[PDB]
Short mmCIF file of C-alpha atoms and ligand atoms in Angstrom, two decimals:
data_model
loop_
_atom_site.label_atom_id
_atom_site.label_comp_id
_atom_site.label_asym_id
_atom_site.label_seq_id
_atom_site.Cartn_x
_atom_site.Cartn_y
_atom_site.Cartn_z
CA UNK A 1 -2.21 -1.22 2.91
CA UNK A 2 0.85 -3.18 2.38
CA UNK A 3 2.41 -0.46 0.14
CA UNK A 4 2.99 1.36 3.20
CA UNK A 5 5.74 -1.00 3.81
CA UNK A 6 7.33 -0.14 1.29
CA UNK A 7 6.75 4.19 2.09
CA UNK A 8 8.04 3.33 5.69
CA UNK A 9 10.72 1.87 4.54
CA UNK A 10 11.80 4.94 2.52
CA UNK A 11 10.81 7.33 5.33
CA UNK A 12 13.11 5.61 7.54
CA UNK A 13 16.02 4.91 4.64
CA UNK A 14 15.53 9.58 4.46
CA UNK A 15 15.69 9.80 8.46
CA UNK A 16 17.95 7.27 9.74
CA UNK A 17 20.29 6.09 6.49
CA UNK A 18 23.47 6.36 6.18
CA UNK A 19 25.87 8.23 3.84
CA UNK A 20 28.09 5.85 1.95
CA UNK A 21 29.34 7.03 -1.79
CA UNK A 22 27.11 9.23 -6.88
CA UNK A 23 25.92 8.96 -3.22
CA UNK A 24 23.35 7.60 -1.21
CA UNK A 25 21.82 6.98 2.14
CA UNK A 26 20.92 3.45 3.49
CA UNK A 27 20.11 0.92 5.91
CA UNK A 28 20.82 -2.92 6.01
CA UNK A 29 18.61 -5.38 6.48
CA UNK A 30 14.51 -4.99 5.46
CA UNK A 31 11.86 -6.91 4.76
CA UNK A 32 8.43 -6.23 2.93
CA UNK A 33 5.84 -8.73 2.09
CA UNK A 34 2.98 -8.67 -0.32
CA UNK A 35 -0.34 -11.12 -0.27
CA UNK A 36 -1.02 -12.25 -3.76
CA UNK A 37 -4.48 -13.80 -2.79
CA UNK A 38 -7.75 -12.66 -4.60
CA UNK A 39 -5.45 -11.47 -7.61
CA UNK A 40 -3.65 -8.86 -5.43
CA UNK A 41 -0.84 -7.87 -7.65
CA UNK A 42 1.74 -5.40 -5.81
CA UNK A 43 2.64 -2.52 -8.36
CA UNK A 44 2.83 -0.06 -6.66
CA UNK A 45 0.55 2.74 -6.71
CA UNK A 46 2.08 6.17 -5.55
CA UNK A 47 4.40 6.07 -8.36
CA UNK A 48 3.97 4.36 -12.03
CA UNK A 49 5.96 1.15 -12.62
CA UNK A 50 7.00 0.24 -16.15
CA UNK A 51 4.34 -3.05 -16.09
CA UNK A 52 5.07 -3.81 -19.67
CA UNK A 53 9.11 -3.74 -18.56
CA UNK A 54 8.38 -6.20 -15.94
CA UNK A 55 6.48 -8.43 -17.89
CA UNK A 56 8.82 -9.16 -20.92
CA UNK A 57 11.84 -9.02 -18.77
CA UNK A 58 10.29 -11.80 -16.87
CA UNK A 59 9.56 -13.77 -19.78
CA UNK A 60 13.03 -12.93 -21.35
CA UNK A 61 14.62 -13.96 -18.48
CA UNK A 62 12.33 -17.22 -18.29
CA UNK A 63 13.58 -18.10 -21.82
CA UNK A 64 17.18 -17.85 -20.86
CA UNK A 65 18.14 -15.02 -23.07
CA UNK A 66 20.44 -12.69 -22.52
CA UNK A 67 20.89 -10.22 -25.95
CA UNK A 68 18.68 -7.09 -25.11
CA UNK A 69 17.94 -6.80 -28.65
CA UNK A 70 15.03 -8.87 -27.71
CA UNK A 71 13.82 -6.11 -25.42
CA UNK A 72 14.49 -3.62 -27.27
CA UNK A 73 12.05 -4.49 -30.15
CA UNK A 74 9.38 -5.07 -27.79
CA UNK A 75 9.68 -1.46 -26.21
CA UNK A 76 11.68 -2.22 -23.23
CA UNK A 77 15.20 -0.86 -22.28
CA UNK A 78 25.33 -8.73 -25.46
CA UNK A 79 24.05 -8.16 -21.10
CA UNK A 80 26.51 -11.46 -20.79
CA UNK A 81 25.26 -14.20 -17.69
CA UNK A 82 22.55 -11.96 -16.56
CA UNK A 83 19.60 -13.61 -14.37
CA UNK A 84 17.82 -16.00 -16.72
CA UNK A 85 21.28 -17.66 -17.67
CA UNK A 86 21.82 -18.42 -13.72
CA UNK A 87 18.31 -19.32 -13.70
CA UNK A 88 18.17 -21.79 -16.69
CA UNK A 89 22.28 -22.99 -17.64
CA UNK A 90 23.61 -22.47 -14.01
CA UNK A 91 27.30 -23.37 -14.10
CA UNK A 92 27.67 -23.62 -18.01
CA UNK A 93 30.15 -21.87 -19.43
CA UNK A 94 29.04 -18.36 -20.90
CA UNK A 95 30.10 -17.38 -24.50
CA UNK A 96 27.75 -15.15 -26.49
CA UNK A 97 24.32 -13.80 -25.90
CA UNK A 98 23.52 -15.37 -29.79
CA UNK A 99 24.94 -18.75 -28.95
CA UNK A 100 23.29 -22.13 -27.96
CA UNK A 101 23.31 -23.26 -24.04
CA UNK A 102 20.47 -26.23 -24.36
CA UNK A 103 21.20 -29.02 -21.87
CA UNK A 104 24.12 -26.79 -20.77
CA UNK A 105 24.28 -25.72 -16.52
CA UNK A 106 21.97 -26.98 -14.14
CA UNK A 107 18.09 -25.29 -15.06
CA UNK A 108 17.07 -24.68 -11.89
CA UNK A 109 13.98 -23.40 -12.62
CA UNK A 110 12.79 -26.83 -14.16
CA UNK A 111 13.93 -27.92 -11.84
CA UNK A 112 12.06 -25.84 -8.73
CA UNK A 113 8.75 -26.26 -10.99
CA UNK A 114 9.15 -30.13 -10.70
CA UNK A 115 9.68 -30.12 -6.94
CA UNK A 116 7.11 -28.18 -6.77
CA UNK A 117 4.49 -30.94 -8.66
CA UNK A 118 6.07 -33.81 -7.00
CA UNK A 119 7.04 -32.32 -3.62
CA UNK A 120 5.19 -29.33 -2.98
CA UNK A 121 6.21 -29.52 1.38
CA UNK A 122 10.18 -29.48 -0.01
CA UNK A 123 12.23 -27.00 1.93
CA UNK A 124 14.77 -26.67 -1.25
CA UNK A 125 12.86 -25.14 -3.69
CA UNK A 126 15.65 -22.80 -3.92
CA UNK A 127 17.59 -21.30 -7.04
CA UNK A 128 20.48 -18.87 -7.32
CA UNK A 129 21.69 -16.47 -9.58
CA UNK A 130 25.15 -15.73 -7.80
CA UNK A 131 27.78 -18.08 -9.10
CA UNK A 132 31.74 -17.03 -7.30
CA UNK A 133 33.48 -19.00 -10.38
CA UNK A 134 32.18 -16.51 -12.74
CA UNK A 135 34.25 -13.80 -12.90
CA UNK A 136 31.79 -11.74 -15.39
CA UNK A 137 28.58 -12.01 -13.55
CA UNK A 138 30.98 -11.14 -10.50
CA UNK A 139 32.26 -7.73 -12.09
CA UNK A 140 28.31 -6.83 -12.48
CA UNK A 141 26.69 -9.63 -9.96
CA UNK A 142 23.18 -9.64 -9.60
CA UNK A 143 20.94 -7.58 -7.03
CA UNK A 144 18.39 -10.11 -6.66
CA UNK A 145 20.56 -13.34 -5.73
CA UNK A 146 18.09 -15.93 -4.58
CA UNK A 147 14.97 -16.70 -4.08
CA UNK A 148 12.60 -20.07 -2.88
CA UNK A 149 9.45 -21.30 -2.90
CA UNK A 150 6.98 -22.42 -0.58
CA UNK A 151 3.72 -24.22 -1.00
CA UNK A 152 1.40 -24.53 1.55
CA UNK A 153 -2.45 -25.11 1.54
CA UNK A 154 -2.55 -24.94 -1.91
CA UNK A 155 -0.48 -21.76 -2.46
CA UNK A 156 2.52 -20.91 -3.94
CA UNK A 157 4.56 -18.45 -2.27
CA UNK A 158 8.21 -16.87 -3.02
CA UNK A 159 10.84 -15.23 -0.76
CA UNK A 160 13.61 -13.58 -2.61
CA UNK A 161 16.84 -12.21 -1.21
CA UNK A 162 18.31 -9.08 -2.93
CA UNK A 163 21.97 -7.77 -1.74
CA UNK A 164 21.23 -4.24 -2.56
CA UNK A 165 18.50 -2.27 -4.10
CA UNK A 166 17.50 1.44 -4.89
CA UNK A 167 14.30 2.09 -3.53
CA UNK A 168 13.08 4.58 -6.18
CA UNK A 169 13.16 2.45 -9.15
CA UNK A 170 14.88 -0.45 -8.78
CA UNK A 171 12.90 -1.88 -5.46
CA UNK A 172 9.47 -1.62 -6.82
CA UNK A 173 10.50 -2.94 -10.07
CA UNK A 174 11.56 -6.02 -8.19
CA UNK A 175 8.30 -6.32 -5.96
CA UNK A 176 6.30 -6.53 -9.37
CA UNK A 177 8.67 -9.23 -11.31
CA UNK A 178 8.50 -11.73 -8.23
CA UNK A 179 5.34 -11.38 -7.31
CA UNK A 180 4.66 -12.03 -11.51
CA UNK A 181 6.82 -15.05 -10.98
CA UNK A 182 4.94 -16.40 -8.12
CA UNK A 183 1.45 -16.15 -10.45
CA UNK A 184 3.13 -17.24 -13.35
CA UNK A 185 4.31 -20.80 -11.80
CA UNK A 186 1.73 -20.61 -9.20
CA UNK A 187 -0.70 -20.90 -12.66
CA UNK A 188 1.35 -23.29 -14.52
CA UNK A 189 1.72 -25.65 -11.28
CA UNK A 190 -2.27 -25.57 -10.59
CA UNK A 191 -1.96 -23.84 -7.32
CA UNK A 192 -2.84 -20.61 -6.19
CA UNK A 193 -0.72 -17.44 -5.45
CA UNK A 194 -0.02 -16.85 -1.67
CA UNK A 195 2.67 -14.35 -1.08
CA UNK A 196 5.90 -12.64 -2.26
CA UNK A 197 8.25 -12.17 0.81
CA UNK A 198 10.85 -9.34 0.09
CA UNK A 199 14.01 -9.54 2.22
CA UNK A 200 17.01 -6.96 1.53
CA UNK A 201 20.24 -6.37 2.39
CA UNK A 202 21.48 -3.03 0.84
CA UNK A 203 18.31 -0.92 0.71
CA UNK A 204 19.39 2.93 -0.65
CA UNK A 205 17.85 6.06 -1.88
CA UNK A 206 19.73 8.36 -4.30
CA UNK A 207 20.55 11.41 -3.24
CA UNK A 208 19.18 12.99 -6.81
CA UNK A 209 15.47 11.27 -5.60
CA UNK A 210 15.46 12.23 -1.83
CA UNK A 211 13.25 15.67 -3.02
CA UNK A 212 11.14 13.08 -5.12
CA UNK A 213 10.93 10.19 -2.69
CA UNK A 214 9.43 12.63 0.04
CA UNK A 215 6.70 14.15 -2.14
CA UNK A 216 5.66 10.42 -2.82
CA UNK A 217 5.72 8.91 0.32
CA UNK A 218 2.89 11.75 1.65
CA UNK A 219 0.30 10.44 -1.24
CA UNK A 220 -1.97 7.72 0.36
CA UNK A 221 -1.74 4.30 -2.03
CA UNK A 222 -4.15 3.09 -3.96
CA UNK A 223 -5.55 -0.06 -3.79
CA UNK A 224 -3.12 -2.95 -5.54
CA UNK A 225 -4.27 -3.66 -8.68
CA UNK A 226 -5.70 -7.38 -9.95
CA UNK A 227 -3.62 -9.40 -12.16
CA UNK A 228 -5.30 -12.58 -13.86
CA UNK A 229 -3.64 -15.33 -16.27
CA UNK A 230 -5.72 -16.21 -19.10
CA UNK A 231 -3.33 -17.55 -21.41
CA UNK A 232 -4.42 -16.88 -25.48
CA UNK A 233 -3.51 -20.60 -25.65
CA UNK A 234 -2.02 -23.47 -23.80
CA UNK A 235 1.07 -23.16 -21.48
CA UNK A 236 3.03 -26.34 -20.17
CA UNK A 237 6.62 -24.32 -19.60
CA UNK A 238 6.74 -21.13 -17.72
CA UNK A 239 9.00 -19.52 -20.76
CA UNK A 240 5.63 -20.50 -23.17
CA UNK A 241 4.13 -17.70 -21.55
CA UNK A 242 3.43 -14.66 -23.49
CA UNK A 243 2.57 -10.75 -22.16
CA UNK A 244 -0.74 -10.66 -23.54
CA UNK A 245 -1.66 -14.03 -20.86
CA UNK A 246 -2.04 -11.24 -18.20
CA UNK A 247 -4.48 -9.07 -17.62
CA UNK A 248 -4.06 -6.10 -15.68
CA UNK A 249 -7.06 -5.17 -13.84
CA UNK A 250 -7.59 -1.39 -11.80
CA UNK A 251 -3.92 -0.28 -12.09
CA UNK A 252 -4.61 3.32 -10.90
CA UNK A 253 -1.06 5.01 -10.15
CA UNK A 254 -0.81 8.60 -8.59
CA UNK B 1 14.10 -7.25 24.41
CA UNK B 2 15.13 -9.17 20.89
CA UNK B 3 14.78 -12.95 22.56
CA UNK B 4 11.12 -12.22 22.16
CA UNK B 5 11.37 -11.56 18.32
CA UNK B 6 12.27 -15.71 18.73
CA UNK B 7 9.77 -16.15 21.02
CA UNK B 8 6.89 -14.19 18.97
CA UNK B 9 7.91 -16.26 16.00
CA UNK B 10 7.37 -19.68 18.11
CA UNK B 11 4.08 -18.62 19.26
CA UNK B 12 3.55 -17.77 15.98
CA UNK B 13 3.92 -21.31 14.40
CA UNK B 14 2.50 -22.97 17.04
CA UNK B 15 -0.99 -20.70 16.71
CA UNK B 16 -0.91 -20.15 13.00
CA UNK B 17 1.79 -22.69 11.65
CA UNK B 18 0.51 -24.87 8.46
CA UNK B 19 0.79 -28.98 9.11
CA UNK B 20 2.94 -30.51 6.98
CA UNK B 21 4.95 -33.93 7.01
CA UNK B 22 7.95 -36.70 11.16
CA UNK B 23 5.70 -33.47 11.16
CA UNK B 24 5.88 -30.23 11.72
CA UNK B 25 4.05 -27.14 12.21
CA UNK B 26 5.27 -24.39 10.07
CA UNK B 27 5.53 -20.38 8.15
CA UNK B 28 7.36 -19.44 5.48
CA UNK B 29 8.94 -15.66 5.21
CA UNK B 30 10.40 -14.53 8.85
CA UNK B 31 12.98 -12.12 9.95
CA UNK B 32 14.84 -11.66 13.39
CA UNK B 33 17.53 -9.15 14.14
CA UNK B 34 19.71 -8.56 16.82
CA UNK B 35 22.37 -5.91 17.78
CA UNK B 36 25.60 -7.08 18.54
CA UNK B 37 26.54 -3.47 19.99
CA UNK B 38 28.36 -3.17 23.74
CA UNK B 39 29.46 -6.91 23.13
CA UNK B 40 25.66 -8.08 23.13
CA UNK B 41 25.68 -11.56 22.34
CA UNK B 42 22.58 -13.22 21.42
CA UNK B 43 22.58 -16.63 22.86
CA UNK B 44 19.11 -17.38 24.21
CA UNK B 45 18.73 -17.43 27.75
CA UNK B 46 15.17 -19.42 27.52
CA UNK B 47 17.15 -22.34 26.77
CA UNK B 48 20.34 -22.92 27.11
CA UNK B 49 22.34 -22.63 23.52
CA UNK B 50 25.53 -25.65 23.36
CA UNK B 51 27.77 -22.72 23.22
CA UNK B 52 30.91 -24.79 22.65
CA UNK B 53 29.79 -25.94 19.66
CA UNK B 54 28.41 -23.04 18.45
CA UNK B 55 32.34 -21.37 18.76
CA UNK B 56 33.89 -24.99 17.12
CA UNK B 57 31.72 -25.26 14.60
CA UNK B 58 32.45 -22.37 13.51
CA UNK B 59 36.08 -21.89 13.25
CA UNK B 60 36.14 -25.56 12.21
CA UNK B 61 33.79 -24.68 8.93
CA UNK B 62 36.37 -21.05 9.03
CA UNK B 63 39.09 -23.53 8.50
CA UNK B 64 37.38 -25.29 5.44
CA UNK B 65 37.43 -29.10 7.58
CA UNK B 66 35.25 -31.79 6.66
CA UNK B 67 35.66 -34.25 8.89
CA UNK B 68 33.73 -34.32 12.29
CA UNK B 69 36.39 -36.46 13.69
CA UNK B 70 38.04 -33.02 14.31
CA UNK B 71 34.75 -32.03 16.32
CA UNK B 72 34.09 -35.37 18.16
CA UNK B 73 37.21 -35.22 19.46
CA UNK B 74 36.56 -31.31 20.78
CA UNK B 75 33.64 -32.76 22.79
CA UNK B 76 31.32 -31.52 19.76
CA UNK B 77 28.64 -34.08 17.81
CA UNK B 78 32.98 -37.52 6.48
CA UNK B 79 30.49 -35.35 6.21
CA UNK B 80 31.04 -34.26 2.06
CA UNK B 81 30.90 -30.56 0.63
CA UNK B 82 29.27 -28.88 3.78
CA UNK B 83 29.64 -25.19 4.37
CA UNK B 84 33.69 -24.57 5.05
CA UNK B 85 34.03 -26.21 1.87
CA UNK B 86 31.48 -24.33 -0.45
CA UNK B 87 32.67 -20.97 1.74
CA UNK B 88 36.24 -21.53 1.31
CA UNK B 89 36.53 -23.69 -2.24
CA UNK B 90 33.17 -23.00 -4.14
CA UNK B 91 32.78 -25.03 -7.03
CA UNK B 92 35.67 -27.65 -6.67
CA UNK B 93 35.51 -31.30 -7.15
CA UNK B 94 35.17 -32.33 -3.21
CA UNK B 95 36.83 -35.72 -3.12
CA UNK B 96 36.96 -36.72 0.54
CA UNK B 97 37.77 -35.17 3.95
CA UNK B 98 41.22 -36.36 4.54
CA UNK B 99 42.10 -34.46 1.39
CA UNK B 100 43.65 -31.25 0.41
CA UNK B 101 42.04 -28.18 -1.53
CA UNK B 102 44.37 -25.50 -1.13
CA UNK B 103 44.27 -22.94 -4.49
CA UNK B 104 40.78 -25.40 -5.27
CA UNK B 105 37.53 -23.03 -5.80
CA UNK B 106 36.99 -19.46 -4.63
CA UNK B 107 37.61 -18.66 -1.26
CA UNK B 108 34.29 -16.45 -0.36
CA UNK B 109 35.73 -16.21 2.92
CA UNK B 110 39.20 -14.47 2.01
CA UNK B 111 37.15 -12.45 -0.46
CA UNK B 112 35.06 -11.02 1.97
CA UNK B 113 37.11 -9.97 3.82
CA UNK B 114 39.44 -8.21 1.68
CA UNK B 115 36.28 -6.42 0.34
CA UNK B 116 35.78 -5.37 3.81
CA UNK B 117 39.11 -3.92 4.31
CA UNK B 118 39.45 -2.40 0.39
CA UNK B 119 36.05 -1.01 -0.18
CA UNK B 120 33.82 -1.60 3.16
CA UNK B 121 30.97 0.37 1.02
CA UNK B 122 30.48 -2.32 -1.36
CA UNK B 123 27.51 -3.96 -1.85
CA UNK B 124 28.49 -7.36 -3.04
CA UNK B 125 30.07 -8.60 0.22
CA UNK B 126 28.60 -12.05 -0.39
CA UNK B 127 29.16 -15.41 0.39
CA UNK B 128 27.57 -18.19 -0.83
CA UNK B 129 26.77 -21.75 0.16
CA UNK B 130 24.39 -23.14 -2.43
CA UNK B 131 25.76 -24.84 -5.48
CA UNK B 132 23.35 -26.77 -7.72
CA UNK B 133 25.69 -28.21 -9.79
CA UNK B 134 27.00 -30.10 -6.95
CA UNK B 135 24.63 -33.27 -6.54
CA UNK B 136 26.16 -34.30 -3.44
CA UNK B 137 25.76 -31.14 -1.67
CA UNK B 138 21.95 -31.29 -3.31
CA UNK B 139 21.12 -34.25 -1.92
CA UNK B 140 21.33 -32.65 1.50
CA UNK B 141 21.98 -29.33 0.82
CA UNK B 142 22.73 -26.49 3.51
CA UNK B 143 19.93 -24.44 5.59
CA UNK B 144 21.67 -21.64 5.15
CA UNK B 145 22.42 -21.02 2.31
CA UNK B 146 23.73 -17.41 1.79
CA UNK B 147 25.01 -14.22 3.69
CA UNK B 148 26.52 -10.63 3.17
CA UNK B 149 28.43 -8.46 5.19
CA UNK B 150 27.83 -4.56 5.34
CA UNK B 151 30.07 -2.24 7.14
CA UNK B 152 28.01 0.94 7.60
CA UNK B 153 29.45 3.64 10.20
CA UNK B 154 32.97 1.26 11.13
CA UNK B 155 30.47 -1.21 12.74
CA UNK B 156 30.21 -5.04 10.58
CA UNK B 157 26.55 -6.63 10.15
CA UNK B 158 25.68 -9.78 8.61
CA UNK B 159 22.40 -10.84 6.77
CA UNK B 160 21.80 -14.63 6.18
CA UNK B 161 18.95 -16.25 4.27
CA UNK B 162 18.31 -19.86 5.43
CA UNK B 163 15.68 -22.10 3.21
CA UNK B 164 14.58 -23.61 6.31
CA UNK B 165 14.80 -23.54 9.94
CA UNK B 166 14.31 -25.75 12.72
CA UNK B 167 12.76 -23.45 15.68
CA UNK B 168 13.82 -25.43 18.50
CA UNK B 169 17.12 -26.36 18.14
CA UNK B 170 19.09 -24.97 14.86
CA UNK B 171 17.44 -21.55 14.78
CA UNK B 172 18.98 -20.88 18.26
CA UNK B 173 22.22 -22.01 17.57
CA UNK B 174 22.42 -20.61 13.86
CA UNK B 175 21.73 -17.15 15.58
CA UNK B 176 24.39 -17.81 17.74
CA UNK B 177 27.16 -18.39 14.89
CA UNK B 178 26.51 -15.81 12.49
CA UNK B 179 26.27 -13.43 15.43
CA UNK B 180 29.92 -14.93 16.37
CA UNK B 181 30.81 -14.95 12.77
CA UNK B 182 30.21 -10.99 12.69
CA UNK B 183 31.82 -10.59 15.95
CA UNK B 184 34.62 -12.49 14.57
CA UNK B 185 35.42 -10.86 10.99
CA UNK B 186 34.68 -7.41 13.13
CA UNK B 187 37.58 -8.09 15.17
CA UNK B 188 39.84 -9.07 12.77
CA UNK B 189 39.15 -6.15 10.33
CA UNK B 190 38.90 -3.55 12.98
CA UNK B 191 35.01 -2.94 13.14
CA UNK B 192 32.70 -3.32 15.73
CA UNK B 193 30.04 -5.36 14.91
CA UNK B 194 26.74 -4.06 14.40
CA UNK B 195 23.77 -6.10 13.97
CA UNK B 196 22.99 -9.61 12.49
CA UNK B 197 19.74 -9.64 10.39
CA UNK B 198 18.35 -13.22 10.10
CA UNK B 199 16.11 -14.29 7.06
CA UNK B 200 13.99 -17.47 7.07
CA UNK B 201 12.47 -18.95 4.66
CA UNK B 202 10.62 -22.24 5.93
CA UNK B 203 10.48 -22.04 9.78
CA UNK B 204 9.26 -24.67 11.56
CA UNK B 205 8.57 -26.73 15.29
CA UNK B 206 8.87 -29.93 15.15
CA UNK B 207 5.26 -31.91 16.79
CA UNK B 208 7.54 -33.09 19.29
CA UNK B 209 8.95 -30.24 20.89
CA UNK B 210 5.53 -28.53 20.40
CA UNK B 211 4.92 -29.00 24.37
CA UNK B 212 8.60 -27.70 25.38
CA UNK B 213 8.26 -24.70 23.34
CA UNK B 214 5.18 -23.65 24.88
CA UNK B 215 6.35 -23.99 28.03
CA UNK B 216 9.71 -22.18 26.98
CA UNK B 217 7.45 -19.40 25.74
CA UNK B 218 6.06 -18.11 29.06
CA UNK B 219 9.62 -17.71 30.43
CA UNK B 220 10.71 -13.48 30.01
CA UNK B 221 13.72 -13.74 28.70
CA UNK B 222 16.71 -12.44 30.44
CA UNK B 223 19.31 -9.59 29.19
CA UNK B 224 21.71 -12.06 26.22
CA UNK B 225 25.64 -12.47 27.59
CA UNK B 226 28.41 -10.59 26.35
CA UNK B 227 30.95 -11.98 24.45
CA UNK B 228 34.53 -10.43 24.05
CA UNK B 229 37.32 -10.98 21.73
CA UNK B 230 40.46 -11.65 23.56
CA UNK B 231 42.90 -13.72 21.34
CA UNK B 232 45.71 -15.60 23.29
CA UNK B 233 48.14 -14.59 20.42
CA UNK B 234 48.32 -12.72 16.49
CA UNK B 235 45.55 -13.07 14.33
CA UNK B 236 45.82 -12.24 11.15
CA UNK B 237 43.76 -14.52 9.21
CA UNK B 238 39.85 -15.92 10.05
CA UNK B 239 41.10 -19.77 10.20
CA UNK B 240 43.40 -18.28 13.25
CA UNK B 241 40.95 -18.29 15.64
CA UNK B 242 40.75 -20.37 18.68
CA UNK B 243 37.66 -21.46 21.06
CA UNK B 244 39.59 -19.81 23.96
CA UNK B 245 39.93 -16.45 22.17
CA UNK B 246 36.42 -15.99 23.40
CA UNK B 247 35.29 -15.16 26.93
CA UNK B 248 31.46 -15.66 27.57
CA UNK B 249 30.33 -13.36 30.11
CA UNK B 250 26.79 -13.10 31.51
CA UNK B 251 25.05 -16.08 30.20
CA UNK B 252 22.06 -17.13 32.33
CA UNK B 253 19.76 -19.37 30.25
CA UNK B 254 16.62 -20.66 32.20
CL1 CL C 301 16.44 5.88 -5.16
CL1 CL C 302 11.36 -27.54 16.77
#
């Protein structure tokens, strides 16, 4: 069970971390990856993760919006150039979170989506969130700072770099939003999901959920859960998609 | 030994690689990592690495040149907004390689390592190469294409994601220059370096070399070189360095 990639690394961030300060302990340098074939969908199982959360911060983020009133009146807890304004208007300059940014910055992800159709063997299917000249994102950068895709034999995969991440929330949080990502264009680009590759560079536990982590890493997962896209109508732009396209199929948490 | 984590990753594309087009035989989603503890170097010894250029390469992109006249004539084979520039002056206009950018973009480089010597806990020790708003640099855009430093226990480790990675020829020598890179910035901040952590996205042998590597693949690899630090004279900034600061000891490729 791939999950237990993610457990091992925990058990080893608890036994062999560091102490660096609210503290933590930590290694540098991990990797997980998660198949997305059959409808495998990685949320992980030996601890509830806020599935609705990822969802509409996805499709938030797809949209380009960045005012967390959004989330808020959708259940979901000015954010300023946050992810989906990298994403969608990189290199535009950032004003307000109510304000207009069409045919502002370089949309990346339009522009991945269309290498994808027209080139799917590309090796630059890249975009980035982490922009130097931007002095606001660089006061509060991003954790998850680039990712690519890949397609090969018909699949779509993703491998996404994140400069730090907490394991007990943060990390699993992250598994489920790319891996959504991955189904979301592999679905809108006709192909079929392959995997989500997970590479880290910061990887910490709290010291406040060390007594928590190590009760949850002795429950055996669960089988993944099935995620399928059956969009309620048609979809020709990944930020078209709505949460109730997705069905969640035999999400069992402990 | 870590040569075989290389070595494993060959066999690997050669025995489950996808075909994909000159061709190649390719995976998408690897990881390598070697220590660079008790002066370990890891320049492979199952064929020989063009050392010299790995060490002028380097302090010529440290020194933010764009010219490979400055290489040819170091024994070393305009080039445009290559990685010295987009380390050193992220997000100027790049104009030509005779030209001067001095105070022009964000120097990543300087940043770094000022984080490393202010706050050497952080988490946002990252440098950047990838700029989509620069079409020139998209039109042949940089294999790798981001790194971070980490300084846990006083020793320096690097982590760099590259999109895409030639197997027989760049992967070897891009292992070499990050490791050097560490080795470097550990010097001149007063680590020792720790480990380099390499990502890949796209990783791939070239049909041509297909017969080489497999013959390259039966040879055990032998214990990597040191490398020590030894500069001729004061160095105070990265730029500073010289090929001769560097004495190679131990290298024994097949
Ligand atoms: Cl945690
Ligand atoms: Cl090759």
């Amino acid at each position: 069970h791939p999950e237990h990639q993610y457990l091992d690394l925990v058990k080893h961030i608890l036994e062999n971390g560091a102490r660096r300060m609210t503290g933590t302990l930590s290694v540098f340098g991990a990797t997980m990856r998660f198949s997305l074939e059959d409808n495998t969908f990685p949320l992980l199982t030996t601890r509830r993760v806020f599935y609705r959360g990822v969802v509409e911060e996805l499709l938030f983020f797809l949209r380009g919006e960045t005012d967390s009133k959004v989330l808020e009146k959708k259940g979901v807890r000015d954010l300023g150039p946050i992810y989906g304004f990298q994403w969608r208007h990189f290199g535009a300059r950032y004003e307000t979170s109510a304000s207009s940014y069409e045919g502002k910055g370089v949309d990346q992800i339009a522009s991945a989506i269309a290498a994808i159709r027209a080139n799917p063997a590309s090796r630059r299917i890249v975009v980035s969130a982490w922009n130097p000249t931007d002095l606001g994102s660089m006061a509060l950068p991003p954790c998850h700072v680039l990712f690519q895709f890949n397609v090969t034999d018909g699949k779509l995969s993703c491998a996404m770099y994140q400069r730090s991440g907490d394991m007990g929330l943060g990390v699993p949080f992250n598994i489920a939003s790319y891996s959504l990502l991955t189904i979301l264009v592999a679905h809108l680009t006709g192909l079929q999901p392959g995997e989500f590759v997970h590479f880290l560079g910061d990887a910490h536990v709290y010291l406040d959920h060390v007594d928590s982590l190590r009760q949850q890493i002795q429950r055996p997962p669960r089988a993944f859960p099935k995620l399928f896209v059956s969009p309620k109508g048609p979809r020709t732009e990944p930020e078209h998609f709505q949460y109730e396209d997705f069905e969640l199929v035999g999400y069992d948490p402990h």
